[PDB]
Amino acid sequence: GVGSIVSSDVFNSIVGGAASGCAGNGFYTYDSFISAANAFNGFGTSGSSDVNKREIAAFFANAAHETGGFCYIEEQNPTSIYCDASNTQYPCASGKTYHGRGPLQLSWNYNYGAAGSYIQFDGLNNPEIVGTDSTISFKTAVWFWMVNSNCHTAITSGQGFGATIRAINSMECDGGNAATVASRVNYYQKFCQQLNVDTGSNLQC
């Protein structure tokens, strides 16, 4: 399992410790990550050692970007509750909010609903659990990576780190946001060095 690639010390060196204004590994804990990772067959384990290390680095690099370096659990100063009232499969619960939570900043009624179906929490009535239970929190991210997006297939099929950016937020690609692409890439290069793996090519999108 992923615990043969990521030791406690390497995890802490990727996520950081709790500090002023920064949740770090106070919320984003090592055994919550491992517990989550090992629940999704293939995550960090499908390919060669190098491919698996790149996958892990790519996951953490996007998560570090989305969370401000693992400082935040929830989207900061949201202006929206992220309720798409047109979605009748996953209707919004009055009084609940669907702004970003967890490593990959799960957002919208429809995504919380789908994630909760898969992971076994009530995403519509209890989206806030993604910000209070670290194992669920990490599971939402690994679900997004493995089930709800092309991230896993991209990084494990030769497409490069940039293709994981495209799978998470394609508006940043094609010139859309050079700065956010640079931030994601900078974390990926750091984490590949910490995991002792070549970054590969095609880092931008």
Side-chain angles (χ1 to χ4, degrees):
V2 166
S4 81
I5 293 143
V6 186
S7 63
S8 182
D9 282 342
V10 173
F11 179 88
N12 293 338
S13 87
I14 289 172
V15 295
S20 166
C22 189
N25 69 5
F27 181 77
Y28 296 110
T29 70
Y30 178 53
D31 71 5
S32 73
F33 167 66
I34 296 298
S35 294
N38 286 350
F40 289 81
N41 294 350
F43 177 69
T45 66
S46 287
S48 68
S49 177
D50 283 2
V51 166
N52 290 341
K53 289 176 171 179
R54 283 190 283 272
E55 175 157 47
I56 295 304
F59 174 85
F60 281 114
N62 284 298
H65 175 77
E66 297 294 351
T67 61
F70 303 98
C71 295
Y72 305 123
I73 304 169
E74 312 181 69
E75 175 173 349
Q76 298 296 291
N77 303 306
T79 55
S80 182
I81 68 167
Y82 302 80
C83 171
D84 175 2
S86 81
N87 193 296
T88 54
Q89 181 172 5
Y90 290 123
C92 308
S94 180
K96 301 292 175 165
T97 62
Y98 307 101
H99 63 249
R101 294 183 181 88
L104 291 174
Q105 291 292 289
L106 187 70
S107 296
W108 293 100
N109 54 305
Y110 48 83
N111 293 317
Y112 279 87
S117 294
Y118 192 101
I119 295 162
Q120 312 300 303
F121 67 90
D122 187 338
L124 299 177
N125 295 297
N126 192 207
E128 54 278 1
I129 199 168
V130 180
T132 66
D133 181 298
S134 52
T135 300
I136 290 175
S137 198
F138 273 111
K139 287 184 174 178
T140 68
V142 182
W143 169 89
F144 179 84
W145 191 266
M146 297 294 295
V147 179
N148 205 48
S149 80
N150 300 321
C151 292
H152 172 73
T153 56
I155 200 63
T156 64
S157 307
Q159 309 301 300
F161 179 70
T164 78
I165 306 175
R166 188 176 294 280
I168 294 165
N169 188 355
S170 64
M171 283 296 282
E172 297 181 19
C173 299
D174 313 306
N177 199 327
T180 60
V181 171
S183 172
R184 295 178 191 275
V185 169
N186 193 78
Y187 283 121
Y188 180 64
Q189 294 174 316
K190 176 188 172 179
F191 301 156
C192 286
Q193 178 168 316
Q194 289 182 313
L195 294 167
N196 188 39
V197 70
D198 188 90
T199 57
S201 306
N202 296 336
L203 306 186
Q204 298 77 26
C205 66

